[PDB]
Swiss-Prot record, chain A:
Its main location: mitochondrion. Component of the ubiquinol-cytochrome c oxidoreductase, a multisubunit transmembrane complex that is part of the mitochondrial electron transport chain which drives oxidative phosphorylation. InterPro entries: QCR7 (IPR003197), QCR7_sf (IPR036544). Keywords: Acetylation, Electron transport, Membrane, Mitochondrion, Mitochondrion inner membrane, Respiratory chain, Transport. This is Cytochrome b-c1 complex subunit 7. It is found in: Mitochondrion inner membrane. GO terms for biological process: mitochondrial electron transport, ubiquinol to cytochrome c. Transmembrane segments: none annotated. It is a peripheral membrane protein. It comes from Bos taurus. SUPFAM superfamilies: 14 kDa protein of cytochrome bc1 complex (Ubiquinol-cytochrome c reductase). Belongs to the UQCRB/QCR7 family. The gene is UQCRB. Pfam families: UCR_14kD. The modification N6-acetyllysine is found at K9, K68, K73, V78, K86.
Curated annotation (Swiss-Prot), chain B:
It comes from Bos taurus (Bovine). The modification N6-succinyllysine is found at K126. The gene is UQCRC1. It is a peripheral membrane protein. This is Cytochrome b-c1 complex subunit 1, mitochondrial. Component of the ubiquinol-cytochrome c oxidoreductase, a multisubunit transmembrane complex that is part of the mitochondrial electron transport chain which drives oxidative phosphorylation. GO terms for molecular function: metal ion binding. Gene3D superfamilies: Metalloenzyme, LuxS/M16 peptidase-like (3.30.830.10). It comes from the Eukaryota. Keywords: Acetylation, Electron transport, Membrane, Mitochondrion, Mitochondrion inner membrane, Phosphoprotein, Respiratory chain, Transit peptide, Transport. PANTHER family: CYTOCHROME B-C1 COMPLEX SUBUNIT 1, MITOCHONDRIAL (PTHR11851:SF116), METALLOPROTEASE (PTHR11851).
Swiss-Prot record, chain D:
It is found in: Mitochondrion inner membrane. Belongs to the peptidase M16 family. UQCRC2/QCR2 subfamily. Component of the ubiquinol-cytochrome c oxidoreductase, a multisubunit transmembrane complex that is part of the mitochondrial electron transport chain which drives oxidative phosphorylation. Coiled coil: none annotated. It comes from Bos taurus. Component of the ubiquinol-cytochrome c oxidoreductase (cytochrome b-c1 complex, complex III, CIII), a multisubunit enzyme composed of 11 subunits. The complex is composed of 3 respiratory subunits cytochrome b, cytochrome c1 and Rieske protein UQCRFS1, 2 core protein subunits UQCRC1/QCR1 and UQCRC2/QCR2, and 6 low-molecular weight protein subunits UQCRH/QCR6, UQCRB/QCR7, UQCRQ/QCR8, UQCR10/QCR9, UQCR11/QCR10 and subunit 9, the cleavage product of Rieske protein UQCRFS1. The modification N6-acetyllysine is found at K8. The gene is UQCRC2. This is Cytochrome b-c1 complex subunit 2, mitochondrial. Signal peptide: none annotated.
Length: 100, 442, 406, 195
């Protein structure tokens, strides 16, 4: 009856992390996996992400945000790291299982 | 597979009314290799007798009286056979490798050396200064000096402690005689073995040996082989520091059982589990061998190797690593730690691989003719007979976790090890410390 | 029952020669030889071979860098890769049923290398050392340069990635270098301790590429180069050569016997503390022949000179038909001997199952070497003395001469 | 007086390439020749100039090339270095060479000489303004000779030859033995055996 699709859209704008102008992945806390994930990132996307974070920080540090225009739109959010991160995880889970 | 082992040609052996034991293995192979493995060494040397066995090895080729230099070599070269050899602490050998179409010719040659060496007093005075140089070379091979020094302190005071090479003072003064005094004393059939592998037909060998080894034992002595003076193991250290060197080497070890001992198996499996590393490999992902893994992750060593160098009645079960002046410690720690783990909480899944890893070297230990002869040459000499790969198989195809634990601990836990370290080792902690590294705070 | 089982060879519809030989050894070893190498590199992509040779352990599509290494080790396995300017041999060894399993990884390492951009971008700094260790051997140094001074274009290219390119090889240059040389026509799934029906039923999965000859390495133009490396090592290494002999080239065997015909001569021709030998390398469309002379500094001039005069007066009739009989036999030896060790042996059933597709029995391989003698040699030597010479050298050298000083 | 005197310099037709991929090759070619004080010197100098507008204007595209000249005590050198893009390295040196070639086979108006004869008069005099490039002249001579050739005769000497040599100084290059040096991608750059 109620689209998870319809919902995610909610949460996304609700989380409003796009008001700072940074993709979902630009937020995921940096744990062992993510670090390795991000450390596998192509230098392109890396510097991209960096700036997005520094900009985010700079905003946040000013208490002000990004013009309604520059927010990133849900459908246009680029899961730039999810793919690497996943391999990572399974890579690990593969290892963790083998060491038993 | 197991069938492959079983279908492996038994090794033939039969001694002479003389004393020599003649054994060997047959295959299709045109080529082959054959040699006499004397129960001779440095261990059998004295305070003024040390060196000979070597100074010897070094004239063992420059001719005989029957056929002087230019000819022997010319006769060897000319037939395309390779006559090579060595001399350890309790083992010396001289093997040749021809086309099997030379069994009788190679065999003769063999006999003509182990029995009649020119020992040209003029040939000697040259090989004298040759060794004294060749020794000065063995010297900057830190990869080795570190082992002799290990022996030096590990078995301090006894015969093993003396290095196969012998002091410069002896090599500078060994007499035409003393060499002969060595030859005639140790080079005897009862302690020598004629072994070979390739396309040879035992009987043909026998008869040739039985033919060129016309030795005759009168007394009961001649027919008896002296057992060696026991060497006292001495948990201690010896440090030859020199921050002037690229890096330091470290070698620590516990007393080994001796060939005989059946545990040398489980023990051998032990060393299989931590194995060795060496920066060229390709594995921060390596198999269990954490020492390896960890060696990578934390860039611990340039290279490390585990070894159970054993002898007649004693041994040296340890490990040796090479590392930057700076990561020496972390390494020991991590390494020495492994021994503990090894004999305190080792798992089946581990030993499983260990075994197969051994079973791989077990097999590849016998890869070709020369090598096969080696075992035969050895086997008999130190074990009494020949251990078939079918045997070794079971021996180590039956070692469970609990067995490794029970073993290693039996020779490592709370034992006083012997450490040796040349190079910039300022970072290696005193003894007590690497000593209390022998018991796990269980 | 006697251990004899004729080595069957069956050329697949691709060009993938499959050579086996059940010799009944407990430990068998499979090997994928290829006509790849550092001969197919251009002024760019250099060393991509070498690097590749190391990327052996990098994740594939059927098994992760992890699985593979621990996979092979969980069996007492051994994967390794031997390569030469014009050929890369991916061997693997184990025993029993474990051969079957040991395969999965060799299969993936050679055909499904997905060289991930990080793994390599994190593996490249290895070249610095892998090379650094190999270069502790002065000998390898002089040779690397020899080929440089002996050629100009493919082949003359280094075997160990040049420095300047240590971290510039791209994850791409790797696929691109493989997609073009690791192709059925130029590969061979050789092997030992195996039943051929099984070693064949594997080539079925190994069927993932066809392109006969993807990039074919340019012919090798010769050059009379000379490149000295002043570095004062108290002892000079020197090598001299005259282009010649090619694998399969009937003119080959000759030097081999001249290789032996030479040696006791150059050596016994140069008294003092040294070492010297007859150098011989046979490549696909070329080769080399000469002699390297490790010799003390100041006594470097003399040494090479004398070593040379000998290769000289060897052409001007100083070779009894006896010297030939003796030397003809040593090869019979060195050949047969260096075949005992299943790895130096599997190297023979391979080399051939690659360059030809046949297998010259030990009988005729002799009948061919036996085949010539007096007839050549004296002359093979002459070829050296006349043609153009290219020298290589490492050491104090200040006392070592140049080719223009013969 | 002379404590260790440096050995005479034996010539060699060496060739040593340094593969290093710098996107642009540096190449130099030479033929032993000319020595300081050696009457045969000045000739190249004017040939140094007689050459240049020729090799350069002889090789179209994005590059650089010049006439190389070094005069040593008992020897010297003469040739041309050509900084050129990678792939266009082959072509560049080749063309640069043909020019030093056809320069010997009569492609030098007695005018080219007058012009070039003057540029040296210039470059000489000019590079003497700066007391350091100048004190370098009263020195070099006060060392090798013990004299001081006034600016007058130093000209009268360069003025002294022209048509008379040059065409020929070039010839010397094309015949004698050549030694090349090179740094760059090179994979497209030729070897002396390929002229």
């Amino acid at each position: 009856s109620r689209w998870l699709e319809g919902i995610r859209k909610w949460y996304y704008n609700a989380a409003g992390f796009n008001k700072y102008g940074l993709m979902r992945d630009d937020t995921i806390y940096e744990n062992d996996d993510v670090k390795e994930a991000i450390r596998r990132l192509p230098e392109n996307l890396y510097d991209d992400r960096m700036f997005r974070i520094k900009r985010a920080l700079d905003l946040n540090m000013r208490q002000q945000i990004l013009p309604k225009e520059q927010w990133t739109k849900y459908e246009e959010d680029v899961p730039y790291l999810e793919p690497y991160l996943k391999e990572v995880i399974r890579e690990r889970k593969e290892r963790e299982e083998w060491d038993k | 597979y197991a069938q492959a082992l079983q279908s492996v040609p038994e090794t033939q052996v039969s001694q002479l009314d003389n004393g020599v034991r003649v054994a060997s293995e047959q295959s299709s192979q045109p080529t082959c290799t054959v040699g006499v493995w004397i129960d001779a060494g440095s261990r059998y040397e004295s305070e003024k007798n040390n060196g000979a066995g070597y100074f010897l090895e070094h004239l063992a080729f420059k001719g005989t009286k029957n056929r002087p230099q230019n000819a022997l070599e010319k006769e060897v070269e000319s037939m395309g056979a390779h006559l090579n050899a060595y001399s350890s602490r309790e083992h010396t050998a001289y093997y040749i490798k021809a086309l099997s179409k030379d069994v009788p010719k190679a065999v003769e040659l063999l006999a003509d050396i182990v029995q009649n060496c020119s020992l040209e007093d003029s040939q000697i005075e040259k090989e004298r200064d040759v060794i004294v140089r060749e020794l000065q070379e063995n010297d900057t091979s830190m990869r080795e000096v570190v082992f002799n020094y290990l022996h030096a302190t590990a078995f301090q005071g006894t015969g093993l402690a003396q290095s196969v090479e012998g002091p410069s003072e002896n090599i500078r003064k060994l007499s035409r005689a003393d060499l002969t005094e060595y030859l005639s004393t140790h080079y005897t059939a009862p302690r020598m073995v004629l072994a070979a592998a390739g396309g040879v037909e035992h009987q043909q060998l026998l008869e040739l040996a039985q033919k060129h080894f016309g030795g005759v034992p009168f007394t009961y002595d001649d027919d008896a082989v002296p057992t060696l003076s026991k060497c006292r193991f001495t948990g201690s250290q010896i440090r030859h520091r020199e921050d002037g060197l690229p890096l330091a080497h470290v070698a620590i070890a516990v007393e080994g059982p001796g060939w005989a001992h059946p545990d040398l198996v489980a023990l051998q499996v032990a060393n299989a589990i931590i194995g060795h590393y060496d920066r060229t490999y390709g594995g921060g992902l390596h198999s269990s061998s954490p020492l390896a893994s960890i060696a990578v992750t934390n860039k611990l060593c340039q290279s490390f190797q585990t070894f159970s160098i054993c002898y007649s009645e004693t041994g040296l079960f340890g490990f040796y690593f090479v590392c930057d002046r700076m990561s020496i410690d972390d390494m020991m720690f991590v390494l020495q730690g492994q021994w503990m783990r090894l004999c305190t909480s080792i798992s089946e899944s581990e030993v499983l691989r260990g075994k197969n890893f051994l079973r791989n070297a077990l097999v590849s230990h016998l890869d070709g003719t020369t090598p096969v002869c080696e075992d035969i040459g050895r086997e008999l000499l130190t074990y009494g007979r020949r251990i078939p790969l079918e045997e070794w198989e079971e021996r180590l195809a039956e070692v469970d976790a609990r067995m490794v634990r029970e073993v290693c601990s039996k020779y490592i836990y709370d034992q006083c090890p012997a450490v040796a370290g040349p190079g910039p080792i300022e970072q290696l902690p005193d003894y007590n410390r690497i000593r209390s590294g022998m018991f796990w705070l269980r | 029952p006697p251990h004899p089982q004729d080595l069957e060879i069956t050329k697949l519809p691709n060009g993938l020669v499959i050579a086996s030989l059940e010799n009944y050894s407990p430990g068998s070893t499979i090997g994928v030889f290829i006509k790849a190498g550092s001969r197919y590199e251009n002024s760019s992509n250099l060393g991509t071979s070498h690097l590749l040779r190391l990327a052996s352990s990098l994740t594939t599509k059927g098994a992760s860098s992890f699985k593979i290494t621990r996979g092979i080790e969980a069996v007492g396995g051994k994967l390794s890769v031997e390569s030469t300017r014009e050929n890369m041999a991916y061997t693997v060894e184990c025993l029993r049923d474990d051969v079957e399993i040991l395969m999965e990884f060799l299969l993936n390492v050679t055909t499904a290398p997905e060289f991930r951009p990080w793994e390599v971008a994190d593996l490249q700094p290895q070249l610095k050392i892998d090379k650094a260790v190999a270069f502790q051997n002065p000998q390898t140094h002089v040779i690397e340069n020899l080929h440089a001074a002996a050629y100009r274009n493919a082949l003359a290219d280094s075997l160990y990635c040049p420095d300047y390119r240590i971290g510039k090889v791209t994850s791409v240059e790797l696929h691109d270098f493989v997609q073009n040389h690791f192709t059925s026509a130029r590969m061979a799934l050789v092997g030992l301790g195996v039943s051929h029906p099984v070693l064949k039923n594997v080539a079925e999965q190994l069927l993932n590429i066809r392109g006969g000859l993807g990039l074919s390495g340019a012919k090798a133009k010769y050059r009379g180069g000379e490149i000295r490396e002043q570095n004062g090592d108290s002892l000079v290494h020197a090598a001299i050569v005259a282009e010649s002999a090619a694998i399969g080239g009937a003119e080959a065997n000759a030097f081999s016997v001249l290789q032996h015909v030479l040696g006791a001569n150059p050596h016994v021709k140069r008294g003092n503390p040294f070492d010297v030998s007859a150098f011989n390398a046979s490549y696909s469309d070329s080769g080399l022949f000469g002699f390297y002379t490790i010799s003390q500094a100041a006594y470097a001039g003399q040494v090479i000179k004398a070593a040379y005069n000998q290769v000289k007066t060897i052409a001007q009739g100083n070779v009894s038909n006896e010297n030939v009989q003796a030397a003809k036999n040593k090869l019979k030896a060195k050949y047969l001997m260096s075949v005992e060790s299943s790895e130096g042996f599997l190297e023979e059933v391979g080399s051939q199952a690659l360059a030809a597709g046949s297998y010259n029995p030990p009988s005729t391989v002799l009948q061919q070497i036996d085949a010539v003698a007096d007839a050549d040699v004296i002359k093979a030597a002459k070829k050296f003395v006349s043609r153009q010479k290219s020298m290589a050298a490492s050491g104090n050298l200040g006392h070592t001469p140049f080719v223009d000083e013969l």
